[PDB]
């Protein structure tokens, strides 16, 4: 279920900065725009659209997230493991930031998206990129703290590793 950056046709990063040791945090995001992607070709386009917005419109080094999750249930590599992100203030150098593609302000993502996120986390721990005792957070805990978080936040609040901050 894991697609590399070259698999979705990513532009190279402008610059890459690494952080050391396994990430102590996992942070769950949604894209808002682009909207939910239904097939692998559509989700590859969603990843390029986010990268283009972050690199070309905002002048950032790369798509801000570590990984994306499509409606196809696939995992898309963004900056990847142990790369400083641009997704969560105070956590960019100590987390894996996972974006579920789509507008998940209120609605619950489909199961294959939730399953892909759990599989990515398990993979990251198994390969030594995520701390085994990682802390799981929602974006409304670290970044947009007045966002209510919706059914997605309620869902991740029930997962093992979910942490109050």
Residue numbers in the entry: 14 to 178
Article passage:
Drosophila PGRP-LB belongs to the amidase PGRPs and downregulates the immune deficiency (IMD) pathway by cleaving meso-2,6-diaminopimelic (meso-DAP or DAP)-type PGN. The main difference between amidase and non-catalytic PGRPs is the presence of Zn2+ in only amidase PGRPs, which is coordinated by two histidines and one cysteine. We generated mutants to characterize the amidase reaction mechanism and solved the X-ray structures of wild-type Drosophila PGRP-LBPA/PC and its mutants in apo form or complexed to TCT.
Our results show, however, that the activity of the H42A, H152A and C160S PGRP-LBPA/PC mutants depends on the substrate type and is either significantly reduced or completely abolished. Y78F and C160S PGRP-LBPA/PC mutant structures were elucidated to 1.30 Å and 1.40 Å resolution, respectively. Both mutants Y78F and C160S PGRP-LBPA/PC share a similar fold with PGRP-LBPA/PC wild type with a RMSD on Cα of 0.49 Å and 1.12 Å, respectively, but in different space groups, P6122 for PGRP-LBPA/PC_Y78F and P1 for PGRP-LBPA/PC_C160S. However, major structural changes were observed in PGRP-LBPA/PC_C160S structure around the mutation. The loop between the β6 sheet and the α3 helix is drifting apart from the active site with a RMSD of 2.37 Å, calculated on the Cα from the residues 148 to 172. This deviation is due to the loss of interaction between C160 and Zn2+, where the cysteine is replaced by a serine. We showed that Zn2+ is totally absent in PGRP-LBPA/PC_C160S mutant as already observed in the structure resolution, while it is still present in PGRP-LBPA/PC_Y78A mutant and PGRP-LBPA/PC wild type. Finally, the addition of Zn2+ to the reaction buffer used for activity assays allowed a small residual amidase activity of PGRP-LBPA/PC_C160S, whereas the absence of Zn2+ in the buffer totally abolished the amidase activity of PGRP-LBPA/PC_C160S, which is consistent with X-ray structural data.
